[PDB]
Symmetry: C3
Subunit: 225 residues, 3 copies
């Protein structure tokens, strides 16, 4: 890895600045609900920072042999999404006021979506790498389903400021989230159609949007109170 | 690994079907307690599926050198039991209505039972592999103890449908769970007395029973409401 | 690793005895709050035991090449602190009666402090190992901050036996905790100024104090009721 260094260093900067902003922002917050939202939201980019730094400094990169090649796989991406997506799922669940049962379904389904997708990236048998991608995406579909059809109805029985803020975020996650299994598939980890430099650029845009952008939408609203 | 492939492929099928059944089953459930039970219970085999698939497709298998040999160790078994046994512990705890303190003891003890048992499997010094087995089983004994003597009394102060369903499950876990440290010890991971093909068959029967069977007993009862 | 074996074997003994004491001690406890305190507190050394044993028996030791050398890094230390420090953070939070938001901040910050510090230990580029140490310590400072200025005020609105016991423990963690990034820096994992034998002795004293000592202070008080 070298050409994409710029993308990784750029993602390390943004996530870093993204954490600083939220920390400084939530400093004056007294409301225990809002205070929880800033807690969950600030932690997402903080983790993303460390994981992006590990990729830039070289750590988060590995080499997996599939096909007639040793392929550079950035695993820190999976280590990032493992703790990051569940927290993003909690923001949405606190907002909408979800059941302890549905949250456990989602966190349980999310862990499977990431780990299973990680197994795909490390799989040395090219073909197989696609089975796990299939299992990983099936689980994402299940998540975006209850997040769209379950949470929405759940947000409707709440204050309009909350109801709407959720609508924005709902669309934002459904659209962003479903980009990963598409970027992955065409990127170097799957059916190579796009080079690593681009794949890395693409994931960099989704990560910043999903982690920092989502945070802005949410934290800068009154829906968190 | 090859001869046992049939056992792994059979366990991948059952766990897979086991997840589909519970998902489709709990679909009509409205009760937030039952809905939590289906949440916890459905997730157990789902994880088991992925872990069993990883073993079949080759991933979940490693080679550990102990003795005058490089020994095939299926680690995905430990990765499975790590998230699976705590969830099974939560089903029993929700049912019986346990204290947040005892649950933390059990989950804390369970994590130690699996990780410690994993350390045993990966230990390159043959002798040592038995110390960890001893520490892993001591922790299982501690778990089956409060699960038998602590939870039972706890179930007694509840509706008889719940009290009884717990009794069934209680026996089912105490008996099933204590089979693992026995199968392990005689299997290839320990004092080789049984071949890998059998060890794998045995764990396959315990896993299906513990994950799917237990689920059936529980989900098909009214005790979950 | 060999000369320090005595330190590791001594830490394995103490942690082991430390677990036995608390188990036997909390056996008569009926109070659900105290029962939670013994639950959280007993589990800290139990984990520490297994991790210290893994280091003695050889498992928890790795070799990382940085500089003109292959350096012996005991990673089981990080695997220990990963589950151990969050639990110690929960003791303090239950005692003081903290918000679910602040606890998530602390556990989230703590995980980053350990993992980030682990990345440092495994980093093959000598220089970099210091960036992660910096990120790991920044996160510890953030933790000792709210643990000192946030929790204290929180303890003040409680029974004096609790208020005071917290004061003792507060100082004990702030002082002990800030010794690790200092021992690390001068030890073999960082700017080698002290040999492994000493580094290991030092961490052995902090671990016993933080895990067992802290437990004694806390469990032998009435503040846990
Ligand atoms: C507490 C301390 C903490 C707050 C301070 C954080 C500082 C930390 C961000 C500094 C980062 O500092 C980054 C370093 C290294 O940058 P490199 O030259 O790009 O490294 C490439 C390497 O050889 C591996 O590449 P491979 O992975 O493809 O193999 O300095 C080079 C710095 C970069 C040139 C600038 C990057 C800016 C960051 C976004 C910040
Ligand atoms: C979303 C998508 C998702 C729902 C679909 C899941 C499909 C998935 C189950 C298909 C599985 O498909 C399994 C594959 C491979 O089976 P193999 O030939 O046995 O592989 C042996 C390998 O060489 C390693 O052996 P080693 O570990 O010992 O080294 O097709 C062979 C398939 C098997 C012959 C049939 C197995 C049936 C499964 C139980 C289903
Ligand atoms: C349930 C069962 C459970 C309760 C029982 C636990 C028993 C368990 C503590 C026994 C431990 O038993 C420890 C063993 C090995 O001790 P060693 O000789 O020091 O091993 C060095 C090794 O070669 C690697 O060194 P390297 O890491 O530097 O490479 O017996 C040697 C024992 C030691 C001499 C004594 C240690 C006492 C312990 C503190 C107990
Ligand atoms: C109710 C049931 C009947 C239905 C449930 C199951 C069903 C929903 C699942 C169907 C889809 C599932 C199997 C996953 C399929 C993934 C699909 C996107 C295909 C991915 O396809 C990826 C391609 C990669 O192509 P290259 O060989 O690298 O060459 C391209 C070169 O770069 C130029 O391989 C393709 C190789 C093979 C396609 C891999 C097998 C997958
Ligand atoms: C209050 C206290 C006094 C008591 C607390 C501690 C006490 C309860 C602990 C005692 C048991 C504990 C040490 C664990 C012992 C495990 C026990 C089942 C022994 C396991 O024993 C396994 C055998 C393996 O035999 P092979 O060499 O492979 O040859 C067999 C070949 O396949 C044919 O080795 C055996 C090798 C050695 C036995 C390994 C040491 C263990
Ligand atoms: C608001 C902002 C302006 C401020 C925010 C950032 C700021 C707070 C961060 C400053 C500190 C941060 C960069 C971390 C610095 C760590 C500091 C303790 C320096 C550690 O320094 C460690 C030494 C190691 O020395 P050896 O080469 O092994 O030789 C010694 C031999 O054993 C005898 O290297 C030293 C090598 C280099 C020092 C490594 C770079 C670090
Ligand atoms: C480049 C950067 C990313 C380096 C990385 C370091 C980073 C990994 C460590 C920091 C971890 C953070 C991500 C943890 C998230 C922090 C947020 C959740 C803060 C949310 O706020 C939680 C409150 C808890 O106390 P109260 O109950 O009184 O409100 O913080 C208490 C607020 C305090 C009292 C005010 C002062 C806060 C200063 C900033 C400290
Ligand atoms: C071969 C298979 C295993 C592939 C593997 C994929 C798998 C890993 C991903 C799936 C993960 C699952 C295991 C997660 C467990 C799901 C169970 C807990 C479902 C329990 O039910 C939870 C509810 C949450 O919403 P409510 O509050 O409205 O009730 O699901 C909402 C119910 C919804 C609204 C009804 C429609 C559900 C369909 C089936 C989706
Ligand atoms: C050398 C050693 C470390 C080997 C390692 C083994 C170790 C890893 C396994 C043990 C794991 C433990 C660390 C788990 C922590 C245990 C503590 C939390 C115990 C706290 O107490 C919790 C209660 C739960 O039941 P109640 O709701 O009725 O009170 O224990 C119920 C109390 C019971 C009913 C009384 C009898 C207890 C005996 C000792 C068993
Ligand atoms: C360090 C930077 C902190 C700086 C924004 C000052 C924050 O201080 C103002 C807080 C409320 O006190 O909210 C600030 C709320 C303001 C009303 C909005 C200011 C946002 C600015 C436009 C900065 C945006 C930074 C991007 C979110 C990060 C880039 C990705
Ligand atoms: C960092 C924030 C978010 C929302 C990241 C989400 C990541 C995913 C939803 C990943 C999805 C994947 C799928 C569906 C299948 C292939 C493997 C992936 C992990 C890339
Ligand atoms: C998947 C469901 C269950 C109930 C699996 C449980 C697994 C165990 C109880 C494992 C026990 C072990 C012991 C006691 C000691 C050796 C190592 C094992 C992990 C096999
Ligand atoms: C086992 C109990 C405690 C309190 C252990 C705590 C460990 C730390 C606070 C570690 C701190 C580190 C820092 C701050 C930076 C370098 C890496 C360390 C993990 C050693």
């Amino acid at each position: 890895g070298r050409p994409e260094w710029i993308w990784l260093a750029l993602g390390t900067a943004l996530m870093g600045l993204g954490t600083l902003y939220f920390l400084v922002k939530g400093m004056g917050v007294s409301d225990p609900d809002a205070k929880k939202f800033y807690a969950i939201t600030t932690l997402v980019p903080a983790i993303a920072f460390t994981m992006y730094l590990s990729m830039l400094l070289g750590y988060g990169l590995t080499m997996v042999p599939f096909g007639g090649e040793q392929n550079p796989i950035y695993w820190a991406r999976y280590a990032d999404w493992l703790f990051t997506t569940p927290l993003l799922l909690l923001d949405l669940a606190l907002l909408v006021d979800a059941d302890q049962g549905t949250i456990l379904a989602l966190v349980g389904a999310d862990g499977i979506m990431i780990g299973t997708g990680l197994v795909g990236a490390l799989t040395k048998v090219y073909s197989y790498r696609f089975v796990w991608w299939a299992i990983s995406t099936a689980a994402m579909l299940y998540i975006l389903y209850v997040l769209f059809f379950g949470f929405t109805s759940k947000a409707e029985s709440m204050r309009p400021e909350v109801a709407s803020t959720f609508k924005v975020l709902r669309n934002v996650t459904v659209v962003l989230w479903s980009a990963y299994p598409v970027v992955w598939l065409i990127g170097s980890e799957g059916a190579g159609i796009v080079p690593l430099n681009i794949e890395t650029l693409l994931f960099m845009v989704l990560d910043v949007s999903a982690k920092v952008g989502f945070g802005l939408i949410l934290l800068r609203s009154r829906a968190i109170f």
